[PDB]
């Protein structure tokens, strides 16, 4: 189908971003949430900073102490027989390889803006930086849903208490109002639907489950975009397919005449991430109508295959201009890319494959 | 504490309950939620039933099929090297001992009623039995919060999609309105506060967490007791204490002058379960004022000891009569017991140990 990868890709890399912590290096500027504001495209970049150690035998985990309001560093020996360092994103206990003790970087959100959709300038300062006890290991992967004049910026809040999803609302990206953890841990990939639907707001989410249950997309309703309920299972993993390991919401649901168009990410058990699509009923989005059998975007460019965590495309937002989607995505957990696609052609793939 | 354990304990045991599934045995009638209705104490018992296999090399998972509305038992060999059968409650993948693929029992809720608080009679039939795709492995551990004339009966909904917490409301225990999964998986030990508090309803909860986080009590607010938000961490585990392994909500929060009194359960890593207490700010129950350092109720009577993994008391509700709390609790994973204690003594222990 028509995938127009921008000539300027990758649009924003770690080389474009200077670290804010002394003794740290920027390892990624990625997974940007996407908004239009005052005539410009905004990307709410996840900027990941890693504390550097001169000794190759030792690695460091950055923890924001919320009580003290400063950054603390926990050191580890790579040869510590109690820990596993094989996933570069995390420092895992050998007895709990399904989770993590610490992360290897600390993230926050920084805005970049563009007049043309292709060339971006960073705001001078960070936008959201860990500010409470739910964010000590970082603020990640901000999504943005605009309803009227209000932008709903929701993001993973990672701490020793779990991975929760929290919400900040704003009309101007300057005055921010904190709305709490809208989803309890363990959850992430929360996408708020862009309008009230038959008297209820909705959001996609993605419980991560210890005991039983796969990494599946769920949906919840809400009277006010603060509290959520009537949780339902929506889109499950598919063994042997591109989304055999996990699925999660990607972009904000796109209203079409055929249903809500869901551009979601899927990964295999080997953590190769692609984008796929699904279509939900317009009036009751708890109903799934169609789903792709093959991806709409895969990691094929060199900036998508090679990086901090390779073989990843991870779209966290897009701007609709008629039939065109200007889709922005993380690549390799390293950088930001852009592409244009067509709604009509995604819809056509859905009809063909379902 | 000066606990008065009921002379008739254990009040209700598996021997008192006949199985509703052909071929099964009742293995527990326990963890009962507690309500007062029409001049009687109601216990919303969790009844757990296990199938009996003709072949002792085979164990059966009693799974409810939500399309056909009946059980479809699934067979597993004890000698199957993909599975671990060492926790008799579960069939576990050897690669995922922190979870389960199946349960070896299936639970539902059945009411028992008493005029005197001590002698109970079962309702003829079940009250809540798996009825959707979120309940295929059972309905467990129902709690009851009465607000005015409405009873909020919330419970664990176990399936292949996860362990969620779901809500049914009723004014008479006969006409029930299903309100959906109020908390997403993975959650349980949900206790709805019995009043609107400064413009919001509140519920304790207890996220179970795969990646990072202990088994800690959280709290959430709600405008309507259907949707919940502003999730906050409330009570965490404590290394070296009776609640070093996990905590969870027990009874419905009790309004006192001093704050909300939370009678919660705690367990060590060695799986001994006790009751403790905490006191929350009356106007903002997200604030914790005091917490016990020793238990309020511990397993010491013979019927409280010898659960499969340890001694267990597990209180899922109580009825207040003045200063007296008539507390009902699961014992040893199998049966129900009752005790009386004084609220003033619990507040007094909170004071003394918080100092």
XYZ file of C-alpha atoms in Angstrom:
709
model
C 0.000 0.000 0.000
C 1.151 3.624 -0.249
C 3.800 3.984 2.590
C 5.519 7.362 2.201
C 8.431 7.291 4.565
C 9.669 10.864 4.927
C 12.965 11.744 3.311
C 14.150 13.319 6.504
C 13.726 10.070 8.495
C 14.776 9.620 11.156
C 13.295 13.027 11.965
C 14.690 13.268 15.550
C 17.487 11.116 16.960
C 19.502 11.122 20.222
C 22.068 13.243 18.394
C 19.479 16.014 18.217
C 18.898 16.087 21.989
C 21.179 17.180 24.750
C 20.903 15.426 28.091
C 19.469 17.178 31.098
C 21.273 15.135 33.741
C 24.944 15.526 34.228
C 26.765 12.199 33.732
C 23.948 10.861 31.385
C 23.562 10.225 27.709
C 20.422 10.413 25.632
C 19.706 6.878 24.343
C 16.377 7.696 22.772
C 13.922 10.270 21.654
C 10.975 8.156 20.642
C 7.397 7.007 20.946
C 6.088 10.571 20.623
C 2.510 11.439 21.336
C 0.978 13.597 18.577
C -1.054 16.751 18.651
C -1.940 19.859 16.592
C -1.728 23.073 18.401
C -1.654 26.719 17.303
C -0.837 25.763 13.714
C 2.051 23.341 14.482
C 2.480 19.563 14.843
C 3.628 18.727 18.407
C 5.484 15.480 19.232
C 5.562 14.645 22.950
C 8.878 12.857 22.746
C 9.879 10.230 25.252
C 13.498 11.145 25.984
C 15.410 8.323 27.702
C 18.619 9.157 29.489
C 21.099 6.562 30.683
C 23.699 7.134 33.445
C 27.128 6.403 32.058
C 29.781 4.476 33.944
C 33.486 4.477 32.815
C 33.951 0.936 34.166
C 32.477 -1.626 31.684
C 31.980 -4.077 34.530
C 29.374 -1.901 36.274
C 25.991 -0.505 35.146
C 23.803 2.040 36.802
C 20.018 2.375 37.292
C 18.577 5.919 37.614
C 15.917 6.410 40.209
C 14.149 9.670 40.900
C 13.614 9.977 44.626
C 10.229 11.614 44.926
C 10.587 12.228 48.752
C 13.915 14.020 48.299
C 13.304 15.392 44.893
C 16.580 14.186 43.371
C 18.120 11.456 41.261
C 19.774 8.529 42.947
C 21.868 5.874 41.088
C 21.849 2.150 42.022
C 24.980 0.345 40.776
C 25.221 -3.277 39.621
C 27.984 -5.660 38.493
C 27.177 -7.174 35.198
C 28.534 -10.469 36.511
C 26.085 -10.431 39.541
C 24.754 -13.990 39.404
C 21.385 -12.694 40.891
C 20.579 -10.416 37.884
C 20.017 -10.655 34.224
C 21.106 -7.893 31.886
C 20.142 -9.410 28.594
C 17.208 -7.173 27.903
C 18.940 -3.765 27.424
C 15.773 -1.975 28.730
C 15.907 -3.490 32.181
C 17.751 -4.992 35.044
C 15.898 -8.175 35.979
C 16.101 -10.542 38.900
C 16.975 -14.055 37.660
C 14.050 -15.346 39.673
C 11.670 -12.872 38.002
C 12.550 -12.651 34.383
C 8.940 -11.827 33.646
C 9.417 -8.397 35.308
C 12.227 -6.018 36.374
C 13.888 -4.633 39.423
C 15.147 -1.453 37.748
C 15.227 0.192 34.350
C 18.417 1.104 32.523
C 17.341 4.671 31.756
C 14.980 7.293 33.043
C 12.493 8.860 30.712
C 10.656 12.141 30.593
C 8.595 13.975 28.026
C 9.924 16.848 25.857
C 8.009 18.634 23.106
C 9.198 19.168 19.549
C 7.169 21.328 17.124
C 6.954 21.566 13.329
C 5.210 23.893 10.824
C 5.634 21.546 7.857
C 5.278 18.068 9.568
C 8.788 17.112 8.606
C 11.271 19.519 10.239
C 11.098 19.789 14.017
C 12.401 22.154 16.708
C 12.611 21.116 20.375
C 11.058 23.193 23.070
C 13.783 24.498 25.288
C 12.865 22.611 28.460
C 11.131 19.330 29.381
C 7.382 19.137 29.334
C 6.685 16.441 31.978
C 9.372 15.180 34.323
C 8.815 12.671 37.164
C 6.882 14.630 39.884
C 5.498 12.084 42.337
C 5.937 8.689 43.897
C 4.281 6.912 40.839
C 7.066 8.113 38.501
C 10.303 7.366 40.097
C 11.579 5.191 37.263
C 10.196 7.546 34.587
C 7.381 9.014 32.645
C 6.995 7.157 29.271
C 5.081 6.951 26.068
C 2.697 9.907 26.292
C -0.438 9.706 24.142
C -2.578 12.769 23.288
C -6.320 12.896 22.673
C -7.843 16.289 21.869
C -11.539 16.689 22.583
C -12.706 20.269 21.824
C -10.104 22.571 23.201
C -8.817 20.115 25.829
C -5.703 17.959 25.194
C -5.636 14.737 27.363
C -2.014 13.741 27.763
C -1.768 10.274 29.335
C 1.404 8.271 29.964
C 3.046 5.352 31.743
C 4.067 6.198 35.311
C 6.677 3.716 36.343
C 7.694 3.140 39.999
C 8.377 0.597 42.715
C 4.623 0.521 43.178
C 3.989 -0.638 39.552
C 3.420 0.584 36.009
C 0.322 2.790 36.084
C -1.215 5.155 33.481
C -1.745 8.776 34.518
C -3.426 11.789 32.914
C -2.596 15.531 32.590
C -5.105 17.853 30.848
C -4.212 21.190 29.266
C -5.617 23.706 26.762
C -2.310 25.291 25.877
C 0.545 22.955 26.799
C 1.634 25.456 29.495
C -0.950 25.289 32.253
C -1.276 21.638 33.203
C -3.712 19.985 35.447
C -2.828 16.533 36.977
C -5.759 14.056 37.031
C -4.214 11.154 38.781
C -3.582 7.561 37.801
C -6.559 6.923 35.508
C -5.624 3.193 35.289
C -4.240 1.209 38.158
C -1.063 -0.781 37.648
C -0.206 -2.855 35.796
C -1.345 -1.042 32.609
C -0.136 1.041 29.710
C -1.021 1.816 26.021
C -4.099 3.770 27.129
C -5.794 5.568 24.185
C -8.727 7.831 24.878
C -11.356 7.909 22.107
C -11.698 11.428 20.646
C -15.403 11.915 21.404
C -18.204 10.931 23.645
C -19.898 7.943 22.120
C -23.597 7.402 22.875
C -23.280 9.151 26.186
C -19.983 7.578 27.447
C -16.295 8.255 26.867
C -14.083 5.282 26.102
C -10.446 4.316 26.269
C -8.368 1.409 25.020
C -5.938 -0.037 27.579
C -3.690 -3.030 28.056
C -3.546 -4.820 31.400
C -0.338 -6.700 31.998
C -1.227 -9.841 33.996
C 0.807 -11.879 36.365
C -1.265 -15.008 36.903
C -3.428 -15.622 33.860
C -4.318 -13.651 30.771
C -2.287 -12.645 27.700
C -1.003 -9.109 26.860
C -4.284 -8.130 25.256
C -6.095 -4.913 24.450
C -9.056 -4.039 26.624
C -11.560 -1.249 26.623
C -13.252 0.743 29.374
C -15.995 3.392 29.541
C -16.060 6.575 31.544
C -18.591 9.351 32.431
C -15.901 12.052 32.742
C -12.436 10.971 31.536
C -11.308 10.664 35.124
C -12.850 7.416 36.308
C -13.178 4.249 34.150
C -15.163 1.086 34.399
C -17.093 -1.657 32.639
C -13.766 -3.201 31.632
C -13.963 -5.556 28.699
C -11.493 -7.700 26.803
C -11.221 -6.396 23.182
C -8.273 -7.689 21.048
C -6.219 -10.709 21.899
C -2.911 -12.046 20.845
C -2.843 -14.581 17.869
C -0.449 -17.493 18.149
C 1.794 -17.878 15.114
C 0.918 -14.397 13.759
C 2.726 -11.044 13.858
C 0.890 -10.285 17.155
C 1.590 -13.593 18.866
C 3.496 -12.087 21.893
C 1.430 -8.989 22.687
C -0.760 -6.258 21.369
C -1.344 -2.693 22.471
C -3.103 0.469 21.388
C -1.026 2.706 19.268
C -2.687 5.790 17.751
C -5.868 7.537 18.929
C -8.933 5.834 17.439
C -9.899 7.378 14.066
C -13.563 7.931 13.314
C -14.530 6.672 9.814
C -17.920 5.880 8.187
C -17.130 2.226 8.593
C -16.229 2.252 12.358
C -13.456 3.364 14.697
C -10.203 2.644 12.979
C -7.562 1.306 15.500
C -3.966 1.448 14.478
C -2.364 -0.871 17.099
C 1.038 -2.424 17.624
C 1.773 -6.096 17.695
C 4.860 -8.013 18.670
C 6.031 -11.548 18.416
C 7.574 -13.452 21.317
C 10.898 -12.288 19.971
C 9.840 -8.644 20.345
C 9.670 -7.668 16.686
C 7.084 -4.876 16.695
C 4.828 -3.939 13.759
C 1.653 -1.929 13.293
C -1.702 -3.508 12.439
C -5.255 -2.359 12.249
C -8.631 -3.145 13.562
C -12.137 -1.729 13.132
C -14.692 -1.355 15.881
C -18.392 -0.612 15.651
C -19.134 3.049 15.520
C -21.802 3.097 18.122
C -20.542 0.432 20.514
C -16.747 0.209 20.241
C -16.697 -2.872 22.413
C -17.546 -4.729 19.213
C -14.679 -5.675 16.920
C -15.716 -5.791 13.193
C -12.534 -6.471 11.378
C -8.786 -6.980 11.938
C -5.815 -7.179 9.664
C -4.021 -10.403 8.932
C -0.823 -8.809 7.812
C 0.843 -5.631 9.113
C 0.314 -2.090 7.814
C 3.943 -1.052 8.802
C 6.966 -3.158 9.653
C 10.523 -2.392 10.616
C 12.330 -2.428 7.187
C 14.357 0.787 7.050
C 17.760 0.735 8.718
C 16.637 3.216 11.430
C 13.717 0.832 12.183
C 15.849 -2.334 12.320
C 18.957 -1.052 14.171
C 19.104 0.944 17.420
C 18.809 0.629 21.149
C 16.081 -2.090 20.834
C 15.953 -3.132 17.213
C 13.176 -4.268 14.896
C 10.593 -1.912 16.266
C 8.092 0.509 14.746
C 5.807 1.926 17.408
C 3.243 4.560 16.329
C 1.829 6.549 19.229
C -0.003 9.101 17.152
C -1.086 10.478 13.806
C -2.646 13.629 12.265
C -5.593 13.066 9.837
C -5.759 15.458 6.712
C -8.701 14.149 4.782
C -7.860 10.629 3.634
C -4.162 11.115 4.526
C -2.660 10.029 7.869
C 0.500 11.747 8.841
C 1.693 8.928 11.284
C 4.633 9.441 13.570
C 6.367 6.470 15.152
C 9.204 5.405 17.378
C 11.878 3.467 15.698
C 14.079 0.949 17.397
C 13.307 2.653 20.754
C 15.832 5.212 19.486
C 14.348 7.839 17.214
C 11.284 9.331 15.637
C 10.135 8.741 12.033
C 7.221 9.908 9.988
C 5.179 8.411 7.135
C 1.995 9.160 5.294
C -0.653 6.501 4.597
C -4.250 6.536 3.500
C -7.222 5.770 5.598
C -9.061 4.379 2.596
C -6.284 1.981 1.873
C -6.100 0.717 5.455
C -9.854 0.263 5.392
C -9.499 -1.622 2.151
C -6.880 -3.897 3.645
C -9.219 -4.623 6.535
C -12.088 -5.552 4.119
C -9.803 -7.739 2.078
C -8.199 -9.610 4.927
C -11.271 -10.023 7.127
C -7.406 -8.149 71.920
C -10.113 -9.803 73.951
C -11.655 -11.899 71.217
C -14.753 -13.961 71.877
C -14.715 -16.989 69.425
C -18.152 -18.477 68.932
C -18.891 -21.625 70.795
C -20.312 -23.179 67.618
C -17.152 -22.624 65.549
C -16.627 -23.678 62.858
C -20.020 -22.412 61.963
C -20.160 -23.911 58.443
C -17.930 -26.542 56.993
C -17.834 -28.407 53.659
C -19.771 -31.275 55.368
C -22.667 -28.877 55.765
C -22.961 -28.223 52.018
C -24.048 -30.629 49.239
C -22.396 -30.240 45.810
C -24.413 -28.749 42.964
C -22.331 -30.467 40.308
C -22.737 -34.185 39.645
C -19.709 -36.091 40.704
C -18.010 -33.218 42.516
C -17.008 -32.763 46.119
C -17.397 -29.545 48.196
C -13.986 -28.560 49.311
C -14.683 -25.143 50.900
C -17.515 -23.025 52.099
C -15.533 -19.984 53.124
C -14.525 -16.346 52.733
C -18.069 -15.241 53.166
C -19.143 -11.714 52.486
C -21.530 -10.293 55.177
C -24.721 -8.392 55.033
C -27.875 -7.653 57.195
C -31.134 -8.088 55.350
C -34.771 -8.373 56.644
C -33.670 -9.172 60.204
C -31.106 -11.848 59.299
C -27.309 -12.052 59.001
C -26.423 -13.202 55.480
C -23.110 -14.919 54.670
C -22.369 -14.934 50.918
C -20.275 -18.077 51.101
C -17.691 -19.029 48.492
C -18.368 -22.606 47.783
C -15.569 -24.390 45.967
C -16.239 -27.741 44.220
C -13.709 -30.120 42.810
C -14.338 -32.906 40.269
C -13.338 -36.453 41.122
C -11.338 -38.224 38.514
C -11.945 -41.986 37.995
C -8.354 -42.197 36.860
C -5.916 -41.084 39.576
C -3.256 -40.370 36.872
C -5.546 -37.601 35.539
C -6.783 -34.365 37.052
C -9.674 -32.399 35.751
C -10.044 -28.580 35.471
C -13.642 -27.642 36.015
C -14.136 -24.921 33.402
C -17.327 -23.176 32.690
C -18.150 -22.686 29.008
C -19.898 -19.433 28.622
C -21.379 -20.207 25.131
C -22.977 -23.491 26.189
C -23.628 -22.577 29.829
C -22.288 -25.675 31.309
C -19.050 -27.165 32.470
C -16.551 -28.591 30.014
C -14.012 -30.342 32.020
C -10.419 -30.338 30.782
C -8.127 -33.237 31.409
C -4.515 -33.203 32.418
C -2.054 -35.893 33.239
C -0.163 -35.732 36.471
C 2.887 -37.077 34.645
C 2.764 -34.281 31.983
C 6.207 -32.671 32.208
C 4.829 -29.291 30.922
C 2.840 -28.834 34.167
C 3.361 -28.558 37.943
C 0.626 -29.868 40.134
C 2.413 -29.152 43.484
C 0.051 -26.333 44.443
C -3.171 -28.376 44.773
C -5.299 -25.323 43.841
C -3.835 -24.966 40.377
C -2.438 -26.571 37.270
C 0.640 -24.439 36.485
C 2.897 -24.288 33.584
C 6.422 -25.182 34.724
C 7.572 -22.035 32.912
C 5.109 -19.866 34.866
C 4.957 -20.839 38.467
C 3.953 -17.320 39.385
C 0.578 -17.949 37.648
C -1.744 -20.788 36.588
C -3.219 -22.240 33.441
C -6.212 -23.684 35.332
C -7.718 -24.027 38.778
C -8.509 -27.505 40.143
C -11.824 -26.230 41.655
C -14.614 -24.054 40.643
C -16.278 -21.543 43.002
C -19.659 -19.873 43.152
C -21.517 -17.895 45.809
C -24.328 -19.350 48.021
C -26.067 -17.532 50.823
C -26.535 -18.777 54.349
C -28.888 -16.864 56.733
C -29.163 -16.647 60.556
C -31.506 -14.966 62.971
C -29.125 -15.268 65.886
C -25.710 -14.734 64.189
C -24.519 -18.156 65.237
C -26.816 -20.788 63.588
C -26.970 -20.652 59.815
C -29.319 -22.170 57.192
C -28.323 -22.318 53.408
C -30.528 -20.831 50.795
C -31.855 -23.641 48.657
C -29.935 -22.668 45.485
C -26.759 -20.709 44.509
C -26.850 -16.962 44.555
C -24.165 -16.146 41.968
C -22.902 -18.731 39.533
C -20.554 -18.101 36.537
C -22.663 -16.386 33.887
C -20.197 -14.796 31.369
C -16.829 -15.157 29.674
C -15.061 -13.368 32.660
C -16.156 -16.151 35.118
C -15.283 -19.365 33.452
C -12.971 -20.471 36.251
C -15.334 -19.242 39.003
C -16.836 -16.421 41.049
C -14.870 -15.987 44.327
C -14.803 -14.039 47.545
C -17.805 -11.820 47.343
C -17.822 -8.702 49.502
C -20.963 -6.699 50.377
C -21.305 -2.983 50.971
C -24.777 -1.638 51.922
C -25.371 1.959 51.018
C -28.959 2.961 52.030
C -31.169 0.301 50.581
C -28.691 -0.919 47.906
C -26.372 -3.874 48.474
C -23.132 -3.825 46.341
C -21.986 -7.355 45.944
C -18.496 -7.419 44.349
C -16.375 -10.395 43.625
C -13.427 -11.962 41.803
C -14.283 -13.059 38.190
C -11.683 -15.586 37.145
C -11.132 -16.607 33.487
C -8.496 -16.980 30.810
C -8.718 -13.236 30.345
C -7.543 -12.665 33.966
C -8.712 -12.136 37.532
C -11.076 -9.148 37.455
C -13.405 -7.699 40.069
C -17.067 -7.402 39.062
C -20.193 -5.875 40.674
C -23.847 -6.847 41.054
C -26.284 -4.506 42.874
C -29.557 -5.529 44.547
C -32.093 -4.204 47.118
C -33.451 -7.676 48.009
C -30.968 -10.422 47.064
C -33.437 -11.582 44.365
C -33.359 -9.043 41.581
C -29.723 -8.470 40.705
C -28.359 -5.885 38.227
C -24.961 -6.678 36.703
C -22.666 -3.642 36.630
C -19.637 -5.116 34.757
C -16.031 -5.461 35.762
C -15.438 -2.512 38.065
C -11.683 -3.242 38.288
C -9.603 -4.595 35.412
C -7.491 -7.580 35.918
C -5.394 -8.368 37.809
C -7.248 -7.279 41.046
C -9.247 -8.544 43.979
C -9.970 -7.725 47.697
C -12.094 -4.823 46.584
C -14.046 -3.120 49.489
C -16.438 -0.336 48.704
C -16.587 2.382 51.444
C -20.176 2.480 52.875
C -20.835 6.267 52.311
C -20.092 8.964 49.860
C -17.173 10.869 51.380
C -16.844 14.588 50.596
C -18.371 14.300 47.174
C -16.788 10.895 46.086
C -17.287 7.232 46.652
C -14.212 5.130 47.438
C -13.043 1.570 47.177
C -10.049 -0.297 48.515
C -8.441 -2.647 45.944
C -5.339 -4.769 45.559
C -3.557 -4.940 42.165
C -1.553 -8.082 41.596
C 1.485 -7.117 39.575
C 3.606 -9.015 37.071
C 6.569 -6.761 36.493
C 7.258 -4.577 39.543
C 5.243 -3.846 42.739
C 4.261 -5.869 45.776
C 0.876 -7.209 46.686
C -0.273 -3.905 48.268
C -3.648 -2.305 49.069
C -4.608 0.605 46.848
C -7.550 2.944 46.878
C -9.659 4.573 44.108
C -12.446 7.100 43.925
C -15.636 6.987 41.930
C -18.597 9.306 41.115
C -21.114 6.545 40.738
C -19.780 3.159 41.982
C -19.499 2.020 38.371
C -16.279 3.758 37.170
C -13.131 4.231 39.354
C -10.052 6.423 39.076
C -7.426 8.465 40.847
C -5.783 5.243 41.870
C -3.396 5.548 44.827
C -1.148 3.279 46.780
C -2.399 2.956 50.418
C -0.929 0.131 52.523
C 2.290 -1.679 51.568
C 3.780 -4.861 52.705
C 6.299 -4.688 55.678
C 9.375 -6.822 55.798
C 9.711 -8.798 58.987
C 6.103 -8.164 60.081
C 2.967 -10.286 60.000
C 2.257 -8.607 56.596
C 5.640 -9.095 54.976
C 4.217 -11.177 52.076
C 0.953 -9.494 51.077
C -1.867 -7.334 52.224
C -5.476 -7.011 51.123
C -8.771 -5.490 52.184
C -10.867 -7.635 54.478
C -13.959 -6.086 55.875
C -15.913 -3.090 54.662
C -14.401 0.163 56.112
C -16.015 1.041 59.513
C -16.749 4.732 60.272
C -15.461 5.775 63.706
C -14.865 9.164 65.247
C -11.219 8.679 64.881
C -11.327 7.825 61.070
C -12.109 4.896 58.779
C -11.236 1.667 60.486
C -9.863 -0.951 57.970
C -9.720 -4.511 59.156
C -7.356 -6.011 56.484
C -5.606 -9.308 56.012
C -1.920 -9.854 56.032
C 0.254 -12.826 55.264
C 3.903 -13.658 55.597
C 5.972 -15.235 52.813
C 5.372 -18.466 54.869
C 1.570 -18.096 54.147
C 0.274 -17.497 57.626
C -2.665 -15.175 57.324
C -3.812 -12.799 60.102
C -6.045 -9.794 60.470
C -4.663 -6.321 61.185
C -5.958 -2.840 61.281
C -5.364 0.516 59.873
C -7.038 3.853 60.411
C -7.583 6.331 57.617
C -8.490 10.007 57.725
C -12.159 10.469 57.888
C -12.451 13.170 55.268
C -9.744 11.949 52.917
C -9.418 8.159 53.211
C -6.315 8.261 51.048
C -4.461 9.303 54.134
C -3.279 6.609 56.516
C -3.209 7.796 60.262
C -2.273 4.576 62.074
C -1.584 0.873 61.556
C -1.182 -2.031 63.887
C 2.196 -3.601 64.559
C 0.657 -6.843 65.817
C -2.440 -8.606 64.661
C -6.029 -8.191 65.801
C -6.969 -11.794 64.927
C -4.556 -14.680 64.357
C -4.986 -18.448 63.795
C -4.772 -20.158 67.194
C -7.893 -22.351 67.562
C -7.634 -25.827 66.033
C -10.192 -25.047 63.209
C -7.992 -21.900 62.251
C -4.899 -23.933 61.817
C -3.747 -26.241 59.005
C -4.733 -24.596 55.695
C -2.824 -26.288 52.885
C 0.076 -23.831 53.177
C -0.304 -22.459 56.691
C -2.664 -21.280 59.323
C -5.334 -18.861 58.012
C -7.949 -16.474 59.247
C -9.538 -14.453 56.510
C -12.269 -12.022 57.417
C -14.417 -10.802 54.530
C -16.998 -8.989 56.513
C -18.492 -7.936 59.908
C -21.666 -6.490 61.412
C -21.375 -3.556 63.811
C -23.803 -3.437 66.848
C -22.609 -0.461 68.877
C -19.102 -0.996 70.002
C -19.330 -4.754 69.169
C -18.239 -6.148 65.787
C -19.631 -9.582 64.914
C -16.756 -10.615 62.558
C -17.133 -13.645 60.218
C -14.065 -15.203 58.762
C -12.745 -17.964 56.588
C -10.679 -20.504 58.254
C -8.042 -22.782 56.885
C -9.277 -22.298 53.336
C -12.337 -24.539 54.024
C -14.831 -23.268 56.550
C -16.480 -20.275 58.313
C -16.058 -18.989 61.898
C -17.478 -16.097 63.849
C -16.073 -13.921 66.651
C -16.927 -10.814 68.577
C -14.587 -8.047 69.441
C -14.782 -4.397 70.430
C -14.106 -1.542 68.095
C -12.786 0.471 71.018
C -10.160 -2.166 71.653
C -9.002 -2.154 68.053
C -8.779 1.694 68.163
C -6.927 1.400 71.397
C -4.384 -1.046 69.939
C -3.943 1.250 66.933
C -3.153 4.131 69.290
C -0.778 2.194 71.438
C 1.179 0.510 68.692
C 1.287 3.609 66.442
C 3.132 5.232 69.313
